[PDB]
Amino acid sequence: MARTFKILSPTAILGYGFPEESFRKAMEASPDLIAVDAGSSDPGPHYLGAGKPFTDRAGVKRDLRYMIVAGVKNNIPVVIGTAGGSGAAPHLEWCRQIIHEIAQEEKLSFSMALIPSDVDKAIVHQALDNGKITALDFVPELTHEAIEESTYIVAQMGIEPFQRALAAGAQVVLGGRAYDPACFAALPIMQGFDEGLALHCGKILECAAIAATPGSGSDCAMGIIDDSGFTLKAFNPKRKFTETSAAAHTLYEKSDPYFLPGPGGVLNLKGCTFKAVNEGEVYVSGSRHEATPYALKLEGARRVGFRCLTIAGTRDPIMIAGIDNILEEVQTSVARNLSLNDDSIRMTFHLYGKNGVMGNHEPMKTAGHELGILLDVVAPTQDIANSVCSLVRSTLLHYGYENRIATAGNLAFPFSPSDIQSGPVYEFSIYHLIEASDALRFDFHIEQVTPEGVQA
């Protein structure tokens, strides 16, 4: 019937790593829960759409080895949200296999719950027709065509599926796509700790030491929930929590810091306080949670084309000064030479050193002494992308721009080959709320992991 609940978040995204000494010091604090976020939409739609991880298998395995060994040894649950980077079926399976390998190598046995977040297209089609879909801010209205042309569709689960898995005795809970705070908050809430404090603590812990200062995406943090607030601490003498660092992480990646919405309710933070306590720790209080009619956020992406790219520098001041017109003239030349006639062939330039990061919103209008010219072509087939990219590359290389004096070639390529096929390109196609229903219930199942695998 303990009056505190201690949560260890080892790293901002499972796979990003952390210092072994930080993790060891955190375990000396005897957490009640080891929890981590394993995924995000911020790396863009490729990862969900193609079924691929944005994290590295060796890094995820390295990080999980510490976590699972520690949780099993000390009888501390380990809870993971958005398995495998994006939390669809292939991502969940990818992370599951890593865990089996750890159990074989470390000679461990433990129960593991798997909670898939995949949503069949038929459910989404039916919900659209029944008026149960709502676009988030600035998102286009959903159509049947967008649903059908998406690949994996996932819903961000809340606390309740994790709670059911934990109540069934799972020692490791491997969740598919999940609302990042829920990973952290599910267990303390079911043990009676305050929902507002637990979800706000989870929102500050979901990126581990990004909420500390100096920040790190690869260092540990702990939150300790008590009856009146929660305390945040790091485990690296070079890092600490401050009122600013903790409050900044309350704003992080949110549209409105007063109201953080998620499945089942909204965190209302107008009463929050941040107080520096002890040495390098912060006590947070006043967070409130308000229930709302239950809805889930769906994510999906669709393939839009295929990309080929090239990168090269220029050091010539005449070429740099005239670069915008040069690129237009090269494009015109290539279209004429290859008789291009498809507006779906899209050539994009990034001029690093002038406006590569901000594009038309860049305030500085002049380059310095060097540009990095990144070109990419997205086209309906890989062959077309490759062909247009190649001709842009060779045309730009030898283009006779006005007043040119460096007449043997215009580009410094760092690599052989100069052109790189990068493959299918995805765009987000679903970013919409769906009203909860029986059909959308998240089921878990528990498997008994052993050093020999899972039996039968």
Binding site: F138, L251, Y258, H361
Partner: protein, 105 residues
């Protein structure tokens, strides 16, 4: 003399808020500084829009978050994260125009 935003702020940054929105966060060094800026009424949509080469109506919200001595500027992403033609998939390096801000106080 004017007071630069950099002289008053500990954090000046951008990030996505999902694939469709860009948020700019400014956390001030002291509550007094935050209140001075808020009272001045100088951190306006017109100011931000001019700095970012957008129309003032493109700024969706400016949110004064008192618990953190922080202000959040919200605008739509004019290229959805990861769309063809994007410059910054995570929305992480769009803060530089704010570094030019100076307040007349």
């Amino acid at each position: 003399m004017k007071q630069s935003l950099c002289s008053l702020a500990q954090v000046i940054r951008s990030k996505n808020a999902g694939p469709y929105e860009l948020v700019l966060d400014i956390l001030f060094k002291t509550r007094e500084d935050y209140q001075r800026v808020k009272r001045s009424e100088q951190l306006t949509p017109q100011l931000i829009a001019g700095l970012y080469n957008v129309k003032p109506d493109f700024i969706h919200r400016i949110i004064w978050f008192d618990p953190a001595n922080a202000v959040k500027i919200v605008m739509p992403r004019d290229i959805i994260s990861g769309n063809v033609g994007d410059n910054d998939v995570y929305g992480a390096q769009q803060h530089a125009p704010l570094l030019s801000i100076e307040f007349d106080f």
